[PDB]
Homo-oligomer: A and B are copies of this chain.
Amino acid sequence: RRRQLIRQLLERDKTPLAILFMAAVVGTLVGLAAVAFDKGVAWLQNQRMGALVHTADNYPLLLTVAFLCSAVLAMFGYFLVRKYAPEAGGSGIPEIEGALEDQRPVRWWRVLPVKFFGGLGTLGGGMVLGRQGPTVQIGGNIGRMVLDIFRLKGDEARHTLLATGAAAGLAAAFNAPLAGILFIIEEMRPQFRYTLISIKAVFIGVIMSTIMYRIFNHEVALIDVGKLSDAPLNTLWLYLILGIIFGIFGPIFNKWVLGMQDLLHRVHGGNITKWVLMGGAIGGLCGLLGFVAPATSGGGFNLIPIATAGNFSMGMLVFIFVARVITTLLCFSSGAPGGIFAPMLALGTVLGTAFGMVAVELFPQYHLEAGTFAIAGMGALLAASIRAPLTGIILVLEMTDNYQLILPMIITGLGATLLAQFTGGKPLYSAILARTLAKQEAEQ
């Protein structure tokens, strides 16, 4: 096939001008959506705080309007999911992945409103889930919606505009352009065959989405962690050890979410009413903890800069980890609309910090800073559970700007994803998509 290949080599990277322009508008819309979605979740969390202030005197009345305000919003978002769009529950990524394999449809007329408002419920209620799950599926569907509207044919166009929607959706959500594109290239694209996802085009999307999100969000980082210390060559072996630990806990965490998915299904059976109720119960639990033990509830992004700095006791670090493992499974395995990425960063930071703590004690000759180990571990549950190491390392890189830690960051990431493989564990998004295609056929 030497003569075919010469022909192809000379025709490389010539994405059709129509697809390039369309990628641009998909970016621009996904950014604005992501911005709105963001401004919305904040406002509801904020109203919810102004409620506690009006009743800050009667403590049992306080604990009650904390629970109920998160209960109502939870339910309202659960309900929007089972009633108009059941594939818009959960993360949002197994589906956009499914869509790229041509095995799940992009019902953009239903998913845009459902995921957006159903999300504003669970996240704005203060449940332990992140903003990214939402924006990525939302972005994919928006990519689908401009396909249909401008009626563009091709496999390229369908896959491309789908992919640049999800990528631009991860990008705006995290202020992480590189991470978004790498998330397509390493995790989202169809994994067992060739495809025509123009990468130049996914880029144009990401650019515009990131610009838009910046127009409404300059001067404040999601995570300010400042410049930490370096890591010397004799210190690397410690990161490898931390990596191994994530590698065995990775797959173990993956099993719990999947099993808690089943176990929580037996509570409702499929019944919209039991389910919506169980939703507002969970949500109320979270909105409650959001007052009495805030580190155990919410997106997790808050306690990252703290844990890194070393302002937690080892008791707090252990407490937080256990408590947040519990509430992360509850909110995520339930089926509430919302992502698992952002709480897996928190879970990794906490665990890494606790390891930095013991690393400092045992080795004063190393001159450690527990903070360097938190940064190492932030992207490690992303490595050991969803098995997208290249994506998390660049994600963490962009959010924390600590490049001098690139070596231990990679090292911990590899060890995590090598021990996750070796102990028989599967990528979370891929092993969830699978159980979903296995039900879409079992009923036959």
Q: Spell out A's residues near B (CB within 8 Å).
A: 1-3, 5-6, 8-10, 12-15, 17, 20, 101, 103, 177-178, 181, 185-186, 191-194, 199-200, 203-204, 206-207, 210-211, 214-215, 218, 233, 236, 387, 389-390, 393-394, 397-398, 401, 403, 406-407, 410-411, 414, 417-418, 421-422, 426-427, 430-431, 433-434, 437-438, 440-441
Contact = CB atoms under 8 A, between A and B. Distances in A.
Contact of A406 (B178, B200, B203, B440): B178
Given A103-B1, A181-B390, A437-B5, A207 B410 contact: yes
Given A211-B236, A214-B233, 6 more contacts: A5-B192, A6-B438, A10-B434, A177-B406, A203-B390, A215-B233
A418 B191 CA distance: 27
A430 B10 contact: yes
A406 B433 CA distance: 33
Contacts of A394: 178
Question: What is the oligomeric copy number?
Answer: 2
Contacts of A206: 410
26 contacts: A1-B103, A2-B437, A6-B438, A6-B441, A9-B191, A9-B426, A9-B427, A9-B431, A9-B433, A12-B387, A13-B417, A13-B427, A14-B421, A178-B406, A181-B390, A186-B199, A200-B414, A200-B417, A203-B389, A203-B390, A203-B414, A206-B410, A207-B410, A214-B233, A218-B233, A398-B406
Nearest to A196: B192
Q: Is the interface of A mostly helix, strand, loop or mixed?
A: helix
A3 B101 CA distance: 12
Contact of A103 (B2, B10, B17): B2
A438 B8 CA distance: 13
Contacts of A186: 199
Contact of A13 (B387, B410, B441): B387
A389 B211 contact: no
Q: Top 9 nearest A-B pairs by Cβ distance?
A: A194-B194, A9-B434, A9-B430, A6-B437, A8-B192, A401-B403, A193-B194, A6-B434, A12-B430
A133 to B, nearest CB: 19
Contacts of A20: 418
A5 B185 CA distance: 18
A410 B12 contact: no
A188 to B, nearest CB: 13
Nearest to A425: B13
A207 B411 contact: yes
B3 A414 contact: no
A407 B440 contact: no
A414 B185 contact: no
B177 A410 contact: yes
